[PDB]
Design a protein around this ligand. Structure first.
Ligand SMILES: CC(=O)SCCNC(=O)CCNC(=O)[C@H](O)C(C)(C)COP(=O)(O)OP(=O)(O)OC[C@H]1O[C@@H](n2cnc3c(N)ncnc32)[C@H](O)[C@@H]1OP(=O)(O)O
Ligand SMILES: CC(=O)SCCNC(=O)CCNC(=O)[C@H](O)C(C)(C)COP(=O)(O)OP(=O)(O)OC[C@H]1O[C@@H](n2cnc3c(N)ncnc32)[C@H](O)[C@@H]1OP(=O)(O)O
Ligand SMILES: CC(C)(COP(=O)(O)OP(=O)(O)OC[C@H]1O[C@@H](n2cnc3c(N)ncnc32)[C@H](O)[C@@H]1OP(=O)(O)O)[C@@H](O)C(=O)NCCC(=O)NCCS
Ligand SMILES: CC(C)(COP(=O)(O)OP(=O)(O)OC[C@H]1O[C@@H](n2cnc3c(N)ncnc32)[C@H](O)[C@@H]1OP(=O)(O)O)[C@@H](O)C(=O)NCCC(=O)NCCS
Ligand SMILES: O=S(=O)(O)CCCN1CCN(CCO)CC1
Ligand SMILES: O=S(=O)(O)CCCN1CCN(CCO)CC1
Ligand SMILES: N[C@@H]1[C@@H](O)[C@H](O)[C@@H](CO)O[C@H]1O
Ligand SMILES: N[C@@H]1[C@@H](O)[C@H](O)[C@@H](CO)O[C@H]1O
Lengths: 317, 317
């Protein structure tokens, strides 16, 4: 067996689907979008028996800015790792992660994260990969708390408009709103979400995918919505193959801190879902939520669907 | 609003599907099979606004034997409880569970369980209903550990026959094997699984659904398998609407304690899956597993799919 670099995306995707495709169905469009467009220092290492790919790991170091946040070179990420089911418990996973980690470490990484990267596939260790938690524990990763993708079928329920205080208006974004949107993001959400807006606009997100809430003329919050016409495959619709026809999604969503706890998030969410419902969306996903916020979406009939465990390894000095 | 009994199964099922159907799709066939055939003292209480069903609870007391186990009247079960999404946080869930619990308590229940009943729908509180854990906590239920349904697509992987010691044979059950099977169950699995065999044979399970492992002529273990021809809807295939065409399942599975840790469970599992694979099964589920056994199935590419929390309320004396 040999470990070396591979960018044979269709062999990777094939191996991905054979092993975990039931619950994380991958397609080449999504795989290439997320790998190729990522701006971090990144690599894919494969394990090979001659010409046959039998495992891989994808890994990154934080070298490119996230909005106003500077890149912290101390942070590295394991985007994914899979060994084929017919070659398990032969040390191949260990060799792949040893190679990833040793490279990262030499390049200055002191904190290693399971998923959560830019252009991630997973916010953390998926519950469906719960047995890998022990694999990571053996290597010195510590298990932390959970995040959740939520699912709901917006075609099946009617909701009541929350009671509208005056001056506030919710509308899909127009091209001329971009200036104001970026000023709002620089003020209120100036890290990863600011950078997603920059990147996603570069890779095919359209104004129709963004909903803005304004007080008078000022942008005070946003949501990102997705349907089967979106040109960018974003995290809510990564697993669209499980969601049937007329799939959709929502996330992220935020309100300026000085306007919180007035029912304005609930209004923005209500209006965002009506837009989707009018676009004939049925099953849709709200991705990468914390436990404490689940009930905010659950009033609109969303339920937890997938769970991911955050996990972190501190490199010893 | 009024709380009273209801056996209007199609209104119940409708309400079930509107609220949680995305993740627990119900059909009337399964609903009626599991409610009507249950042998425990059982009731359904609904909440009504005039003629409109707006919530329900299904509950049971352990009054009928489980194989060699005597019924313990101290144990009661909440099979399910749902309030419609447009009537939440009005105390309706509280009123429904107060009525269930007060009845049970007067009838001698001291221990109340969330799911896990005979003809259950849930082994415990589903992860998709994680926010209800707080609802149950407020009422004095304590949260315990998790069980898991596992999923795999048996059409996508080839497995190698484990190495066969002599005298042991795995074959689908024949009618004349019933005597020996029952003797084995009375010896090794004389509780719930014995009773399931008795009941399931009464409600449509066929010999083709049971695989036996024998040493010489003696039955030393079994599995239950399911495909789209089974006449009984058992727990592995409760959620067959999520599993596509050519769905199937497996569980339970057991080996006589004196033959354990010899690779015989693995052989039985291997042979059971080959039978399914030859029956052209694709996605299939292994239901209600403990954490410690997941890897036994995971060698055959099964992954956790759904998670349920055990929860128990002790009635104060
Ligand atoms: C960020 C993310 O990518 S999260 C998702 C991770 N990937 C997956 O879950 C995909 C499915 N699983 C896999 O591909 C593989 O099981 C992997 C990658 C997790 C492990 O690969 P392998 O090559 O089998 O691991 P390796 O043989 O190196 O195992 C080394 C040790 O880790 C531990 N380990 C590995 N797998 C498991 C398991 N399923 N349960 C418990 N411990 C385990 C064991 O100590 C093992 O040593 P052992 O064989 O003596 O028992
Ligand atoms: C065995 C099983 O059946 S497990 C599955 C249980 N059912 C489900 O999860 C289905 C989906 N959910 C539902 O149907 C409902 O949310 C139920 C049945 C859980 C609760 O019904 P409701 O009528 O809304 O509950 P009720 O109004 O009585 O709530 C009473 C208290 O419980 C607690 N509670 C109820 N729901 C929640 C929640 N989502 N999060 C936190 N606490 C809650 C609160 O303290 C609440 O009081 P509050 O309104 O002052 O906050
Ligand atoms: C979540 C959020 C939009 C809710 O808005 P809110 O106005 O505080 O809540 P309301 O129900 O009172 O409206 C708001 O708290 C917010 O923007 N939070 C920060 C961003 C965030 O965490 N969003 C959720 C991502 S899943
Ligand atoms: C699970 C079981 C079949 C595995 O068999 P085993 O022979 O012990 O394991 P092998 O891999 O050595 O074969 C066996 O331990 C058993 O029957 N256990 C009791 C019943 C049980 O818990 N079954 C699993 C239900 S999910
Ligand atoms: O763009 S910002 O980085 O300033 C705001 C980031 C807000 N969220 C980042 C991702 N998590 C994930 C947990 O849901 C929550 C907060
Ligand atoms: O029939 S017996 O009751 O003797 C054997 C019961 C064995 N199992 C009952 C159900 N649990 C559920 C956890 O998987 C495991 C053991
Ligand atoms: N819920 C949002 C997601 O929608 C988003 O993909 C993720 C990463 O930016 O942040 C979360 O807080
Ligand atoms: N894994 C089995 C299931 O297949 C079965 O439905 C349940 C209840 O008998 O017992 C579990 O141990």
């Amino acid at each position: 067996m040999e470990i070396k670099e591979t960018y044979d995306f269709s062999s990777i995707v094939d191996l991905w689907n054979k092993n975990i495709g039931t619950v994380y169905p991958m397609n080449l469009e999504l795989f290439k979008q997320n790998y190729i467009n990522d701006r971090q220092r990144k690599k894919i290492m494969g394990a090979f028996n001659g010409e046959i790919l039998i495992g891989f790991v994808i890994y990154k170091q934080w070298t490119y800015k996230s909005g106003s946040l500077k890149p912290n070179h101390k942070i590295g990420y394991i985007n994914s790792i899979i060994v084929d089911i017919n070659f398990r418990h032969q040390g191949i996973g260990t060799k792949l992660l040893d190679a990833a980690e040793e490279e990262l470490i030499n390049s200055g990484v002191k904190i290693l994260r399971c998923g959560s990267d830019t252009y991630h596939f997973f916010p953390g260790i998926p519950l469906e990969c719960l047995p890998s938690e022990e694999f990571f524990l053996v290597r010195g990763y510590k298990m932390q708390d959970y995040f959740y993708d939520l699912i709901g079928d917006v075609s099946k329920v009617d909701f009541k408009k929350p009671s509208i205080k005056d001056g506030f208006k919710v509308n899909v974004m127009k091209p001329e709103d971009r200036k104001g949107l970026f000023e709002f993001l620089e003020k209120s959400f100036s890290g990863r979400w600011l950078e997603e807006f920059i990147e996603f606009f570069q890779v095919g997100m359209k104004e129709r995918d963004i909903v803005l809430i304004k007080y008078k003329t000022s942008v005070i919050g946003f949501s990102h919505i997705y349907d089967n016409k979106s040109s960018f495959i974003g995290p809510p619709i990564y697993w669209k193959a499980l969601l049937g026809h007329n799939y959709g999604g929502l996330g992220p969503i935020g309100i300026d801190k000085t306007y919180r706890k007035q029912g304005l998030g609930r209004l923005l969410l209500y209006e965002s879902l009506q837009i989707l419902k009018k676009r004939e969306v049925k099953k849709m996903v709200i991705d990468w939520t914390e436990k404490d916020i689940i009930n905010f979406y659950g009033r609109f009939n969303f339920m937890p669907w997938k769970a991911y465990r955050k996990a972190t390894k501190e490199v010893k000095d």
